[PDB]
Amino acid sequence: PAPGPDSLLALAFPSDPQVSPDGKQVAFVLAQISEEDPAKPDKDFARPRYRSGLWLSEGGAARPLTHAETGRGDSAPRWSPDGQNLAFVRSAGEVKAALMLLPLKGGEARRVTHFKNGVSGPQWSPDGRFIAFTTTADTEDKRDERGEARVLTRPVYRANGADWLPERPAALWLYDVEADKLREWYAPEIGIGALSWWPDSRGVLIVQSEDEWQASQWRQDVYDLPLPTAPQKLLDWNSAAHGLAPHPDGQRFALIGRPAGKGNTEHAHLYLIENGQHRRLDTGHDHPVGDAVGGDCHVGAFPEGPRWLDGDTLLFSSTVRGSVGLFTAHIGGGVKAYDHDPQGVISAFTANEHGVALIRESATRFPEVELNGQRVTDLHARFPFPVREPQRVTFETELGEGEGWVLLPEGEQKVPALLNIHGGPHTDYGHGFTHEFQLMAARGYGVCYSNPRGSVGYGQAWVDAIYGRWGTVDADDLLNFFDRCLEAVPRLDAAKTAVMGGAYGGFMTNWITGHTTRFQAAITDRCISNLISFGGTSDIGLRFWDDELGLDFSRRADALKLWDLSPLQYVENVKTPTLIVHSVLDHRCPVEQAEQWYAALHKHQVPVRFVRFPEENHELSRSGRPDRRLTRLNEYFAWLERWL
Amino acid sequence: APGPDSLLALAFPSDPQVSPDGKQVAFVLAQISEEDPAKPDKDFARPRYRSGLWLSEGGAARPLTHAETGRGDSAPRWSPDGQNLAFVRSAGEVKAALMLLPLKGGEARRVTHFKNGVSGPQWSPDGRFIAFTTTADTEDKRDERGEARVLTRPVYRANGADWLPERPAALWLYDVEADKLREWYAPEIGIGALSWWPDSRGVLIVQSEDEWQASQWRQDVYDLPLPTAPQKLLDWNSAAHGLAPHPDGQRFALIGRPAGKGNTEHAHLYLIENGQHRRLDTGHDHPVGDAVGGDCHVGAFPEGPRWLDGDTLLFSSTVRGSVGLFTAHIGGGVKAYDHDPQGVISAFTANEHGVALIRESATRFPEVELNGQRVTDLHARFPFPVREPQRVTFETELGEGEGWVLLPEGEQKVPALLNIHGGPHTDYGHGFTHEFQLMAARGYGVCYSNPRGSVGYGQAWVDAIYGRWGTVDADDLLNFFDRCLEAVPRLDAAKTAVMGGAYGGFMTNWITGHTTRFQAAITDRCISNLISFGGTSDIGLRFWDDELGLDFSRRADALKLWDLSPLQYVENVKTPTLIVHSVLDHRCPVEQAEQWYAALHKHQVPVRFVRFPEENHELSRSGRPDRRLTRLNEYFAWLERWL
Amino acid sequence: PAPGPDSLLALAFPSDPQVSPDGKQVAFVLAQISEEDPAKPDKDFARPRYRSGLWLSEGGAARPLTHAETGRGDSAPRWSPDGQNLAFVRSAGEVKAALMLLPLKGGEARRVTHFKNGVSGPQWSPDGRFIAFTTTADTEDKRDERGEARVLTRPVYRANGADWLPERPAALWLYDVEADKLREWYAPEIGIGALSWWPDSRGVLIVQSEDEWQASQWRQDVYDLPLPTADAPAAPQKLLDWNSAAHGLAPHPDGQRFALIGRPAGKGNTEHAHLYLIENGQHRRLDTGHDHPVGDAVGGDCHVGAFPEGPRWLDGDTLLFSSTVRGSVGLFTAHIGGGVKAYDHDPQGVISAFTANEHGVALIRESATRFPEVELNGQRVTDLHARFPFPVREPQRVTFETELGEGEGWVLLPEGEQKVPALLNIHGGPHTDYGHGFTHEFQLMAARGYGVCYSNPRGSVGYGQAWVDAIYGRWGTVDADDLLNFFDRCLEAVPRLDAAKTAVMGGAYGGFMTNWITGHTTRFQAAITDRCISNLISFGGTSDIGLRFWDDELGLDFSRRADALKLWDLSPLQYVENVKTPTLIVHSVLDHRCPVEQAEQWYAALHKHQVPVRFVRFPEENHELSRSGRPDRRLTRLNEYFAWLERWL
């Protein structure tokens, strides 16, 4: 009785590992999967939902601090600097996201805020006097409820995962801890991105764009916002910035991003800011800041903000050849490894001068929470079937050897071979934990997955190789890799092959099937078929192709080049039975992309099936509602069983 | 000056049903009232259509029903003995119940009790049965639960119906004498037109063979006897509706076109005998049915042809912006029956004893007539004075084209609004357009014309744009507009705007991408990208094939479709543009508007996008009254800003 | 398989027989019993409800005009004087009671009024120009919904069947038919009772009390209210200082005189209602030589809805009215120039409602053996007895001697020849009659094998005023004597009645008397006391008529020490220590005529004495449960009666 997609329901998902100020404790979030209303289940329709609570460890096995029995649960634990309180956010039905304050030495939490719309992103000031957070407060918008028109004048009006953007951005508020009083601090005209307190608690640094157009073009600056008694521009960056890390000296700060002129394809790096000047801080390290390795067992928030361990040393995470390690950057030197397992992924971390807490996983290990190197969870033990170990298969390119992996099922008999293509394109497969892949191998498929040119963990030149020319050397690498897998692993059945992928991976599944008939089945997920219409419909359409391809869909000559890069131009060649998976509120890859592919395959009488999820967005496979994650996997396996 | 809320004063007639003895008409009248008159929202008005049945025996019509909640009463159908009216009632949770009203006294009785209600009641001529369709008590909880929809059929949504059900509505019978209901025929695909044989032995129905043929508009006619399965009667493999069984019980007529050219060919009238067909409306180079624009039609507008005797078939036809009644004869050709070249007959019913119809003009709001006598007084409700247009012509290689200019009162210069009708194979002309009258009442000169591609000027005028939208049609529109400026000196050539919906929106996008001459533009339910339209539109699998000879799923054709896409030329657009679109418009999907909006933003062109939830392609003609007001408010706000 | 209480669910109930102005048609109301929501029945709990529609006949079998499928339905049909329209009242959920206008020659009804609270009592003016009606319009009272206190200052604050009286009485409104306009006519400070149009349509006559205290004492006057002619309408003008009970105003065709039904000041509640001709403040008895009350006061249980009995002038001399005579109800004419003549009087039948004009008459007629039927000009137009689901049986007469002459009662026997238990049933009032009304309960008792014995002791109403007066001030003496003497005569006259298996039962006054009898003899094997009275003192303070009932019936004021002691000596609860008979107690919580504290005391006292007792307590219902309560609770009441009799007999 091979395991099925409902294996997902056995798992619990950790997030947001928050080390205590004294370094001796970790508070974190654990999402379990439970019935929407455990008291009143629907006899005809199961309703598995995420429900989260806060957990705490001092080094031993973690224990629950909260006990949600309804609603989405509790999130965003934040330690008071004196270690005696945890602020957090509670969602329970009509309580959308209330700021709560829990004394750790005894007693229940008190609700601090009372806004119709709840709050987001609490951060204590380092001196403990304040908690900053954002909120839309009590603003009401009855247009959708009444059936009124929405009048659009801004260039970007929706966002994947948030749906439709409000007329007024969330405002920055202050909770005065001593006075037990709330006050609006700053109501931005455009929106606040990253935010960090100065170490002396005099105010915050914030990222803002100058206007709506600049925001759509990913141009941001950093501003200084003192405690109230308006922000002042602190850095003319005119580019992408987040992860502000104020230096202990209270004057300098680091930021994560890229300098102006770069473009989305440049690795995110660390920049030291002093008196409006900047210089690269993580020198000699040809890898991006942050976790960009694929996996599907992350639900919730995964903090990766860099942290100064002393006056010279900035701790950060970085993706390297399918792994994610901790490194230190130094004002006085180059980058040094801090905690880097080439076969593992550190997906979130917090730190101070006294301790570190993180979440760690591998291709064979479900995510676990650690405190100062000690595991405090036992979550892999919940994984309900045995995991298998992948084998490495390499392929040659003019830039050097690329790599990928084969995950084989048990036994020695021939098994179908599944080419899985990661999205991005500037991410990696490798050492993230992928329930989907382990499940495919448990059901008898050989899973082949690789990092073609365009992937992100192999240096900037490997990223740049596909610039302006998706469908050339990246497609070459994928089929070269797959051919090397079939040659290296004889039990892979070259007569029973499938190609599948999501997002860029869906683009590439569409590209590949329009350029070869070799596969017996295809599954294209949250895909791209028409690069022109994407420019006009995607929540990043106003800048994505400009950065990835140098092409502006609103300019005639560029639009023709985008059409020649569109899989739909070559759809007349598709003969491979194709399953199309898409979600209606995916604003990253809008569902019109899938509709066009579906219609075109029908025009050609190619066997086709389109599973269309309401309510979900681009993130379904990684964090969608559990029932719909089950359905997506069920549909994958039904299609493979039919054609392989 | 009057504003868009002038619409709230109007009452909208529909479905003029003459009685079997020819001496009465029953019809539907939609008034606009609060959603819940008992509990109005102090902060938000909720004007809604609410309909009742009305009756006339020759004098001023009087109401038979008095709905105060719900959408109201529709689809009146006379019993053959004249003593009863069947109709359909919508009142909240009562979706669409079949009701039976005795006409000589007493209230109606409810006949059906289906969760999903019924549609399309038709009495058998002998009065023994009422046929109707229903999805009965079928439930679909996917959307309510948040479940996926699995799609395998080529067409899965339709403008105005949203998502198509897995099982089509089934045909049912009400046994009048027995007071019993029974399912008659559950089709696999769907039933189109339906008509009883004159001897009440069964019905003729239009059906497609399978889902793919349905997407290609290929239908056949079947014979379905009363129960005691359908048998194919005509190998048509093409578009057919308007079944009119001949009194002899063997032959029948239909409206449509034979297999061959495609759906740009004029719809014509065909006599069917023993599987053979021959055209009846010969010597008449004009399509069957009303294809003239207007915006005061709410509800059902029957146009089914009717035999006035064994030799004479009554039908309606569009001719140079008018819609007239004509008769075709078995013995040869077409004669005018009731045709004013300056008017539009939008619906009619008839038998051997009488005729009832709805009639309008560019200056006359729709009224109901019985045997030539008006029985309504609806024009009197129109809340501001109407003005009369003047005709302006233009020259082409196919002959003289025509259009009109509607001017405000006074003598001063006024801004000039080039309005472009959709289709493209429809006409402007002699329909009543509240929108145009309101524009002139607010001080604008409205210029509207029938370029090549329009439908009322013969087949060659239609064919002139085949495969080449954006060539001679665009030429004609600007030719006409230039002639208006020359002929009408009050039009201000420095304050001009271009606007249109659907094909007219395509053309507004095309024109602004090819000239900067206009000071403002309004593009409504538009098309910007012919490639993506092919994959998203509810008719995308056939529309360009018929209209352009192009298949978006074939590489060479898709490039030709891109060369016809206004979005290819958007870099030239400088004209401030208002974009009006509805989220459930499945005819022109809203991604068309999203692409135009985004492209104008990339170029920093002044742009505004009014995005209506819940509405579809038909908003301007029959959308919810509050959203029709908002659409017009937005039109005028934009024109006031830029003109 | 003997029938049970659910036999009630097979019946349909006619009411409000309205003859057309031309005398050739009748429109009436028919209540069927149907599920609350036939579409969504509760699998675990049946919900039978009354649902009414309008029916029409020109002499043949009646046909339905309306087709309510939800809600309580349609009521109060009223003909337009030109015969072409019916006004009526529609109740459908949130539509509480809307005035509707139905054209009779084709088309559906139009809703005329749009008030949150609906309307009551539509009456066309004779010239057809107006419809008068009353309404509380859109007034809201959120006290109960919010849990606020109710502050009481008025002497009467609740009424059986209406529950709690509003601070502002319903106002009289006018519908102007030609103008299609509505306007408030008169907002009374106290309340409007009877109302009638003058024959020339110049205005209405209305009955009103001068203040809240006088209303509580049943003292009313007649007022003249002309049609309004300005933004603020003229007020009513007092027309007759009656200072007594008045209803059924019947304006004379001459437009000046009018008759009224009631009693002159002096006489209390026990005086027969009579007809009085009023002329310029003078009054004289009109129904002379007729020692019987106006109106139907005969018991039965198959009346749901409104039963009009307003007297009607057939010409300048002749006033048609109904009257109770020895257990029957007949039509009679009173004459300005002479005495009373029979018009339509079957001594074995009951005419329960009628309307009339110079061209025709419509009525409802029944008997002890015939379920109510609607008639037009002497022709039955319904077939409602045919629905009665088991055979009906014929009562036999048994008489008894009194010092005032022979009293009478009846025995309804089951089939067969074997001994059967004997049930003494006692009618309420006390000033009503048993006799020739149709009683489903009695027919059902006999169908289940009981001999039903029921009579008109002194105090009953159909045997002349002196027979009523015999019990004045002394309930529990000659009335109890008559009841037990009658029952003994039944046992002697009908040998199959089993003297060892007897029960006593009754409602209201009949419940008082069941309590009295069981406290004064142990002869019965079972007792059923329904909507009863046990404590005359507390009744004075809790009943909706407590401020006047004993004063009129007994000459006793509970708020005066000497009188209260006499009321205690008349209270069955004083003698409860003697009760040994197993007793079923039936009562409803919103019975404001006999408040439920009456039953609570009897229940507690029998418990103190360890007498077998069972108390069925109905929510929501009032004094009228057995005659018009919700069908499911009517079934339960009957089930409980029969369960108790099966246990003890």
mmCIF file of C-alpha atoms in Angstrom, chain B residues 270 417 468 472 534 624 632 640:
data_model
loop_
_atom_site.group_PDB
_atom_site.id
_atom_site.type_symbol
_atom_site.label_atom_id
_atom_site.label_comp_id
_atom_site.label_asym_id
_atom_site.label_seq_id
_atom_site.Cartn_x
_atom_site.Cartn_y
_atom_site.Cartn_z
ATOM 1 C CA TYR B 270 -34.185 28.200 -45.167
ATOM 2 C CA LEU B 417 -17.275 62.181 -30.065
ATOM 3 C CA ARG B 468 -7.782 42.656 -42.342
ATOM 4 C CA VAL B 472 -10.515 49.800 -44.578
ATOM 5 C CA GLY B 534 -8.201 33.101 -28.948
ATOM 6 C CA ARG B 624 -27.363 46.172 -12.935
ATOM 7 C CA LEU B 632 -21.851 56.496 -17.728
ATOM 8 C CA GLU B 640 -15.057 66.612 -18.861
#
